[PDB]
Design a protein around this ligand. Structure first.
Ligand code: MN
Ligand code: MN
Ligand code: MN
Ligand code: MN
Ligand code: MN
Ligand code: MN
Ligand code: MN
Ligand code: MN
Ligand code: MN
Ligand code: MN
Lengths: 106, 99, 80, 93, 93, 105, 98, 93
DNA sequence: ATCAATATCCACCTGCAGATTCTACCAAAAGTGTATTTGGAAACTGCTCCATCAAAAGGCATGTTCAGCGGAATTCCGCTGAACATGCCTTTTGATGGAGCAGTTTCCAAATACACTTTTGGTAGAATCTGCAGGTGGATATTGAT
DNA sequence: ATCAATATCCACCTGCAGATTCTACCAAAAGTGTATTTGGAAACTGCTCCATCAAAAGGCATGTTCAGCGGAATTCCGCTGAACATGCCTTTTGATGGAGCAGTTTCCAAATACACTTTTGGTAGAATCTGCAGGTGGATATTGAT
């Protein structure tokens, strides 16, 4: 007896991802590798956000990641910001940004 | 001789200030009434979960803040720094919310 | 007061501030209340339809979250 | 009462990246949102890929094309690698 | 080899509303797209409606909420009546 | 022998609509009422756009509806316009419209 | 000789092209552009002719609608002449560039 | 015959964006209700259009490769457009 | 450009709300065996797309002339920001009934699953049909010129 | 203001492809009629958590005051694009042939869908644990006037 997640070398739920697929009405049948592949990709994307979110946590002298750190991580990254282009991260604020023309004479 | 900060200087201060934080900006209760009121026009005798009303506030403020960013670019485009009703209108027009 | 009026010039100005706005025409305030109203009427009309379909009496965060998704305004951190 | 979520796994993964780091209640909720959203987009895109091709099965081939249509430039290339790795590994087992 | 379309139906409906009016193939192609598009939007909304409610059946009840979620007010009001009517009539058979 | 559309008093094909719902994996099961209702909605909206389009055709003194008539129909009606706000009708053109500021004295 | 004043023929053209549905870009040139771009993603590819047509119908409706927005932008700045900064602003708010 | 070569060559395609001419760009603007055009607008439209086509074509070819086909079909484009939120009626989709 | 008035930043301590870890249940995933089905391979086909070729005219490019647009600059009224004194009300606990959202068991109507009789939608098509595309021009405006 | 140069709309008429009418083949579909499985409403009651009145209380909304400077109007003129005319390139059109590809048909097996019983990974509530919100205030820093 071995978790499909371990045979694939993943932390993510290969088995539940497989069940979420059957139940979601995406297709009649779901091939063997599909849940593995998808689990693998979901883990990858999570590791990416947490990594950037993490660094964002450090940079603010804190050790635990709050929503704001997720926001800074996503909106500062060209690619993630595009993937989450029409998604609102609750309690994330906005990136500091003042239109230079608004700055006082200098 | 009192001390007066020049017009606009306190304004830029509030900007850096609020762009640093993530806390809501509409008083929670006043917001609760507006939401209850509106829902009422659709179905009477309605109850809302706490998070439900919270979700709406996060959504509402994220929406408005972003519209202000767009509204500001429209003002700047017209060589101004004061945002006006027509800037909001041009923004919503181009986004597809109007028509 | 109409409740919408409960959305004060100071609150609005604050939102505008996070939006990077520096100056603000006096009429912006009303214009903003109307815009907000239209926004909430849209999401809530959809949220309620979900409640109503669920033969329920309470509006859950999930009804809101679904309405927002439905409106292309996907929200994270309240279920879903 | 039983209510599923990806929280534990998010947390395992977090440790693999930032061993000495934690995560607020809300932030973890957001992460769960994320995984569901992305799951849906990929599944759904995969679902119509199979229908466009008059195919009744969703294989990893579909998950792969889906990831390509959905993820921005570099994000897609990396995701596809990881995806392929695990399937290869999973078969060698 | 043989493909389908709502062409014959769109034509039946065209004659009821404009008996002396015809339709070019291009215009009919566009009409065929419209039906398929609206069909998908409605079925899709109904599909997720059912999922949210852990129902495994899509009933006219789901089609109805979908129609309400999807269509602009005045259009929703009429479509819902024509649909409630059709089903009711159907049942009396 | 009676077509399931005829007792529903509909022109759109209830059987067909019923199979498409199945073939699409929208749900595990599809109640008998669902396809009747959806086919009535499709029939309705198509009658609605054929009405508006036929009028646009008759105004251009044409007998057969072409794509530009479908476009004139949709874009002149608020609702249909919103229903199809993110849709492009091939060969439809745009509505004749010029901003006032661009006009002469 | 005769000379219409600047803006007159322009307005005439607007009325002319808003009254029709003909594609406004030459076919062949458009087509080469499609194969060129497509060849850069995958080599040896042929196209159904309707495929090119669909791309041209989608491209022109997109550009025409983008010009409408751009126009509102120029008029917003009190101009009647559209400029790159006008196209840039329209795409920014549409969320294409930002 | 199926020997040394690649089976004859079609001339190399280069600089085709320049085919979208100033006159064509002005015609589109006219239909968009534009009365006056700055000289710099032409190159800007070409670049915008190039980004537009790359995006659609990139998705279309992705469905094409997925079906293990060598011909980009109208359905491929139609799905590509739907995908980008630019649904097109009149070509099978 | 120096004070001088003020707001934002940053150091240290400490206790609790909120995060993390531990503690046994059990829904769900994994393991084995039988049954059902999908979709690549091989082999022949047939529509479709590619690439010419030839003729010719529609439309692109270029150069000239100047109308009028947009932006620089100066002016000046009044709208909005900063400041401040007055008090209304939103916010924080938090404790208390009960409308309601759910968890559990029962089970009829409603929805499969499958074999059969029967109709209808799609395709080819020769026939005929017939809406309307493409090309010319005076009557009716409306300038642009003088 | 009078007069010539002109674009567009609507009528003129036959030229033919694109739409409509049978003629009929004819299967993939839909309808009909059993045997059969089951999703979900219905009656039922627990553990949520939603509405709410108490209500002290200071954080925050508000009304007024004073003038800083931003927006909007006006005047002006360089020079950029609009209009147009000339030359002629290349797109458009239409008929033609060749091949590579797509699509249909038959088949063998690898792969997936059950059906059922055995094994824990994941969840919830409780017990253990700690990161950072907060309070205080001189230090650092930026703003504004004489
Ligand atoms: Mn190339
Ligand atoms: Mn001017
Ligand atoms: Mn009760
Ligand atoms: Mn028939
Ligand atoms: Mn004509
Ligand atoms: Mn059940
Ligand atoms: Mn100024
Ligand atoms: Mn030349
Ligand atoms: Mn265990
Ligand atoms: Mn602190």
């Amino acid at each position: 007896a071995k978790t499909r997640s371990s045979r694939a070398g993943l932390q993510f739920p290969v088995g539940r991802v497989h069940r979420l697929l059957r139940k979601g009405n995406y297709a009649e049948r779901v091939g063997a590798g599909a849940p593995v592949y998808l689990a693998a990709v979901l883990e990858y994307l999570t590791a990416e956000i947490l990594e950037l979110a993490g660094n964002a946590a450090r940079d603010n002298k804190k050790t635990r990641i709050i929503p704001r750190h997720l926001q800074l991580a996503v909106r500062n990254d060209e690619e993630l910001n595009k993937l989450l282009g029409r998604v609102t991260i609750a309690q994330g604020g906005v990136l500091p940004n003042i239109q230079s023309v608004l700055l006082p004479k200098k | 001789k009192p001390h007066r900060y020049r017009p606009g200087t306190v304004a830029l201060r509030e900007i850096r200030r609020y762009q640093k934080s993530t806390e809501l900006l509409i008083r929670k209760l006043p917001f609760q009434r507006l939401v209850r009121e509106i829902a009422q026009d659709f179905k009477t005798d309605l109850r809302f979960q706490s998070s439900a009303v919270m979700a709406l506030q996060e959504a509402s403020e994220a929406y408005l803040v972003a519209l202000f960013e767009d509204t500001n670019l429209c003002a700047i485009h017209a060589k101004r720094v004061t945002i006006m009703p027509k800037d909001i209108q041009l923004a919503r027009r181009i986004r597809g919310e109007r028509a | 007061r109409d409740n919408i009026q409960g959305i004060t010039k100071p609150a609005i100005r604050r939102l505008a501030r996070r939006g990077g706005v520096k100056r603000i025409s006096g009429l912006i305030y009303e214009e903003t209340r109307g815009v907000l109203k239209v926004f909430l009427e849209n999401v809530i009309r959809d949220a309620v339809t979900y409640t109503e379909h669920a033969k329920r009496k309470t509006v859950t965060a999930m009804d809101v979250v679904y309405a927002l998704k439905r409106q292309g305004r996907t929200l994270y951190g309240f279920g879903g | 009462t039983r209510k599923e979520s990806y929280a534990i796994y998010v947390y395992k993964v977090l440790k693999q990246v930032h061993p000495d780091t934690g995560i607020s209640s809300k932030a973890m909720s957001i992460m769960n949102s994320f995984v569901n959203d992305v799951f849906e987009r990929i599944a759904g895109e995969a679902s119509r890929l199979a229908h466009y091709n008059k195919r009744s099965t969703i294989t990893s081939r579909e998950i792969q094309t889906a990831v390509r249509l959905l993820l921005p430039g570099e994000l897609a290339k990396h995701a596809v690698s990881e995806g392929t790795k695990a399937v290869t590994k999973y078969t060698s087992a």
